[PDB]
Amino acid sequence: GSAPKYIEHFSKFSPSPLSMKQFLDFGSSNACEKTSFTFLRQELPVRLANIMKEINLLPDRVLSTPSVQLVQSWYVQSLLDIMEFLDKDPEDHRTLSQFTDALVTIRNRHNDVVPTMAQGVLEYKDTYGDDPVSNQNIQYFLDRFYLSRISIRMLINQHTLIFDHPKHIGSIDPNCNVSEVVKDAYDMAKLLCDKYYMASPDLEIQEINAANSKQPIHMVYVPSHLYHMLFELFKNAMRATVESHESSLILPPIKVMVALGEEDLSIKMSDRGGGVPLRKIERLFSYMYSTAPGYGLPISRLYAKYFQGDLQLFSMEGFGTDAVIYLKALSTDSVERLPVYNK
Amino acid sequence: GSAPKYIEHFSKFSPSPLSMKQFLDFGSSNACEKTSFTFLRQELPVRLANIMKEINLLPDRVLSTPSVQLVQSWYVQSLLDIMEFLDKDPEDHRTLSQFTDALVTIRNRHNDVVPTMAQGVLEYKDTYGDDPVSNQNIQYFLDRFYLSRISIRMLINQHTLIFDHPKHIGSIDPNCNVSEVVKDAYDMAKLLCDKYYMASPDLEIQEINAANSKQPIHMVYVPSHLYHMLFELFKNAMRATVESHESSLILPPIKVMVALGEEDLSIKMSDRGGGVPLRKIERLFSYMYSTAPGYGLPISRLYAKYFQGDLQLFSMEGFGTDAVIYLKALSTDSVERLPVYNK
Ligand SMILES: COC(=O)c1cccc2c1-c1ccccc1[C@]2(O)C(F)(F)F
Ligand SMILES: COC(=O)c1cccc2c1-c1ccccc1[C@]2(O)C(F)(F)F
Fold it and tell me: Residue A43: nearest ligand to its CA?
């Protein structure tokens, strides 16, 4: 075959990071399925090949494991699917129709990658141990691998959702009400918490719009990404709150604050679930230390970092924990954070 | 001379980190000026020579600057002062008396090192620029240099204060009431804030003793170190609170929480001084970016880290900032964090 040839060629190109404003302007009224196809048939192989070349640089002790090999075969096949559209003509409506169906097949093919890499991490711990040098190598690779996967899925979701005057531009809401997303993630976590604990804390939301005290806080963002982060944070904050008060009757509420600054949009989730010692907080974001025979926090941070944001934890052992999602307030600052294969 | 010979010899030894419990047990009833002299005349040259060898490994562009040369001459002279006590006999009371006076002279000799290195950092910015590679090199060296200096001053303070049944063991309070130190640092910052702004926010303290809800929170620590950290944090929180409310009348109070867990003793200082964007928070701990023709935060964190703690900032732009001091709750976990010269 010629899969190594394709990887070597496109890995020389660097991925082109797109801003949130670019996604919005590309997918709005000026959206053209021809233009998106011309861009994607080149950018998708570049992003695929860059992470595929990093996978090849893994030691053969990891490269020859069944988990890495299975995932690498998914990327080879996905890369080859995109290759067949290079010589195709964008002026043919059947060419664009087959390209969209090919993206859906690729998206569903990689749908079960989180438990697969979780199996791979557990295999590495039981084969070579959990030394701190191995954790940093696993953390470094998995962060870049998953962030690369988020960026590829973002491109595919924007194309397939738009080419199928709505208010949503694919997966992007140009008027995303942050408090409403907080409530949705809270309600879902409350339903799970009531079914398993027969008790759940209440929600308190406070907004701080520094520039316009009266106006509700809106932003341009991907609501599903923000939901994912808040949902994982709500589940942890409820689990800790209920378990740390089993012998008590009062159940402290979960307090969420949404602050809109001139540059940052910050979401703080405060719980009183007993807190966690600092020594163990720094391990909650580690794939290796969060794997048992549990990736909500590490992946949630990658979603935050994907558009130049962050997700941070600071706890008070014996009381509770604060979780803060940092997002860019302006669409011009919300640029893709992409891993690039360098030397 | 033979200053390079001494440096090369003692730099092969590694510094011996002492725990807070060791300091307490060494300096209490079983304290012996003979034993402390025997240990210090060996450990002080080892710690001096280790940082002096790292200074020699700096590039000549920095090593030949007047600031580094002036400081290096202080350490050479301080090292030579300790050398004269190697052949001396510990059984002579005049030998121990001259050793204590020599430590006082060394402590006062290095008393003006913070503005000197501040001048050196400004000289580097104006000579070679403020590139991110230079910041990481300056940050890496200054952190280790200052932490080394804190550890040397700690040893000297313990010897000179004890050998001159008190409740304080040198600079260590085995029953340090944390809230009382918070109040002292607050009162000092309030006096400065009223003199310059004619207004100051109020203080609110809440204690959370998880194991003993009724008992006030005590710990074994160095009160002057904790005061220094809280004083710098109070000055920043008051400056931001007053300035961000000049056009307003209500002045939000500064809320401090002291949590005692099974492993951590955490002190959170919450202000509503408008907050800082995340992009600039990460630069507040940088010596290079905090130098203008301002080291309260970087040095305060080193004091926290000195006994296996930390100091962290997380702000909400448009609202306020939380500052958290993490300390070890147990004296057995409060071990010196010392930089060691490796390859
Ligand atoms: C006028 O510009 C475009 O139409 C366009 C141009 C380049 C890339 C894309 C578009 C587009 C439009 C709708 C959905 C997805 C996309 C993209 O594939 C991307 F933004 F996701 F990269
Ligand atoms: C019985 O142990 C000792 O007396 C002792 C032994 C080794 C080192 C020290 C002491 C001691 C005592 C009082 C003040 C300072 C010190 C030390 O120089 C150190 F702890 F600061 F290192």
Answer: 1
Which amino acid is located at B273 in the chain? G
User: B264 and A314: CB-CB below 8 Å?
Assistant: no
Give the span between the Cα atoms of A316 and A322, in whole angstroms.
Answer: 8
**Nearest Cβ partner of A310 from B211, B278, B322?**
B278
Contact A322 B322 (CB under 8 A): yes
DSSP at A331: G
DSSP letter, residue A252: P
Q: Is B177 helix (H, G, I), strand (E, B) or coil?
A: strand
Q: Are strands A319-328 and A264-274 parallel, antiparallel or unpaired?
A: antiparallel
Q: Which of A319, A325, A327, A330 should we substitute to test contact with B (largest number of B Cβ atoms within 10 Å)?
A: A319
The residue of chain B with its CA nearest to that of A212 is: B318
Tell me the nearest-neighbour CA distance from A152 into chain B, angstroms.
26
The residues of B whose Cβ lies within 8 A of any Cβ of A are 208-211, 257, 259-264, 266, 268, 274-275, 277-279, 310, 312, 314-319, 322, 324, 326
Could you tell me where in chain A the CATH 1.20.140.20 domains are found?
A: 1-167
The neighbouring-strand residues paired with A255 are A204, A270
Give the CA angle between residues A234, A238, A244 to the nearest 5°.
Answer: 150
> Resolution reached, in Å?
2.3
Can you give the C-alpha Rg of chain A in angstroms?
Answer: 22
| B228 flagged as catalytic | yes
CA distances from A177 to A207, A226, A237, A330 (A): 11, 11, 22, 14
CB-based contact A85:A37 (threshold 8 Å) = yes
- For the CA of A32, the nearest atom of ligand 1: 4
Tokens found for residue A273: 């679930």
C-beta of residue A182 within 8 angstroms of C-beta of residue A227? no
Contacts of A208 in chain B (CB under 8 A): 316, 318-319
Alpha-helical segments (H) within chain A = 3-10, 20-27, 33-56, 60-63, 66-83, 93-109, 114-128, 132-162, 178-197, 223-243, 278-281, 296-306
Which technique was the structure solved with, according to the deposited record? X-ray
Question: Where exactly does CATH 3.30.565.10 map onto chain A?
Answer: 168-337
Which CATH code fits A168-337? 3.30.565.10
Nearest to A47 by CA among A94, A23, A82: A82
Q: How far is CA A279 from CA A73, A275, B309, in A?
A: 38, 12, 10
Domain B1-167, classified CATH 1.20.140.20, yes or no? yes
Q: B235 catalytic, yes or no?
A: yes
- Rounded CA gap, B81 and A39, in Å? 71
Phi, psi of B67 (to 5 degrees): -70, -50
Asked if A266 lies within 8 A of B326 by C-beta distance, the reply is no
Query: What is the rounded CA–CA span in Å between residue B39 and residue B29?
Result: 18
SS3 B90: coil
Distance CA A254, CA A272 (A): 8
Structure tokens at B35: 């034993």
Q: Nearest CA to CA, how far is B60 from chain A (Å)?
A: 29
Looking at residue B195, the DSSP 8-state letter turns out to be H
Select from B315, B16, B129 the least CA-distant residue to A263: B315
Separation between Cα atoms, residue A249 and residue A253, nearest integer Å:
13
Radius of gyration of chain B (CA): 22
